[PDB]
Amino acid sequence: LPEPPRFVETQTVKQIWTSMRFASLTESIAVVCGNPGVGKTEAAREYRRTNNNVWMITITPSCASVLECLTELAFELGMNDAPRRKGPLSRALRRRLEGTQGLVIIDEADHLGAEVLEELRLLQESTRIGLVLMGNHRVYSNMTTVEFARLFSRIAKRTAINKTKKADVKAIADAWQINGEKELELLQQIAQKPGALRILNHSLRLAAMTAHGKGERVNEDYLRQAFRELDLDVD
């Protein structure tokens, strides 16, 4: 019956905003390597939504080249007049973004070739801007160890988040107006299982839509009805 919150600031969100603003204002490269289902994509989307001079793209294996990634960057910077070449595209990206004190955000940096990430680091080094990587722990694990070693000298900042926190899901429950202590422990048990923010928000929206359709309050019984579903331990 109250509003379902689309987002809440957490301890992990306040950490990743600190590292984000650090990589931007420092104008240096930071890696966010950690297991997904923790919210780094939506946190970076929230940062780009709140703050200007911030740019965030995604990288697919269908867009794993240098040219496709720079085309994504040209679409993100607001330039539909991107040349199909690699050279003058790169120099136009260098022209547009110089002096902006901007921030480039890279999601799924584990799908990168060495030439692609090398062109991105030489780009940001020739632009005096900040670069932020996302993905699993393989993003850092592809570097330990000699081809990204100068990049390992440029990579100074990383905040690695494997699993969530107690105050993390506590602030989430505060956003969703949850005060049951057994409910708190059950949400922590949800946070124990992987895909934590995903499975958590699934269970929360199931319980919320159930409590609105039945006209009631989300209780621990609606949490058991939601979390008992989704077939997580089914092989």
Ligand X SMILES: Nc1ncnc2c1ncn2[C@@H]1O[C@H](COP(=O)(O)OP(=O)(O)O)[C@@H](O)[C@H]1O
Annotated binding site for ATP: 34-41
43 binds ligand X (CB under 6 A): yes
Name the residue among 127, 123, 131 with its Cα closest to residue 44: 131
* CB of 15 vs ligand X, minimal distance in Å: 12
Touching a second copy, residues 153-192 (CB under 8 A): 153-154, 156-158
CB of 232 to a second copy, least distance (A): 8
Which spans in the chain are helix H? 11-26, 40-50, 66-76, 87-97, 114-125, 138-141, 149-154, 166-175, 181-192, 196-213, 220-227
Nearest to 187 by CA among 2, 1, 10, 3: 10
- Give the separation between CA 92 and CA 123, rounded to whole angstroms: 11
Q: Is 119 in the site for a second copy (CB under 8 A)?
A: yes
- Residue among 31 and 173 whose Cβ is closer to a second copy: 31
Instruction: Work out whether 190 is an interface residue with ligand X (CB under 6 A).
Output: no
What would the two tokens of residue 94 be?
């260098």
CB of 69 vs ligand X, minimal distance in Å: 17
Stretch that binds ligand X, among 35-43, 58-66, 82-90, 111-119 (CB under 6 A): 35-43
Contact region with ligand X (CB under 6 A), list: 15-23, 32-40, 89-97, 185-193: 32-40
| Amino acid present at 135 | G
The stretch among 169-177, 183-191, 193-201, 217-225 that binds a second copy (CB under 8 A) is 193-201
17-to-24, 60, 197 alpha-carbon distances in Å: 10, 24, 17
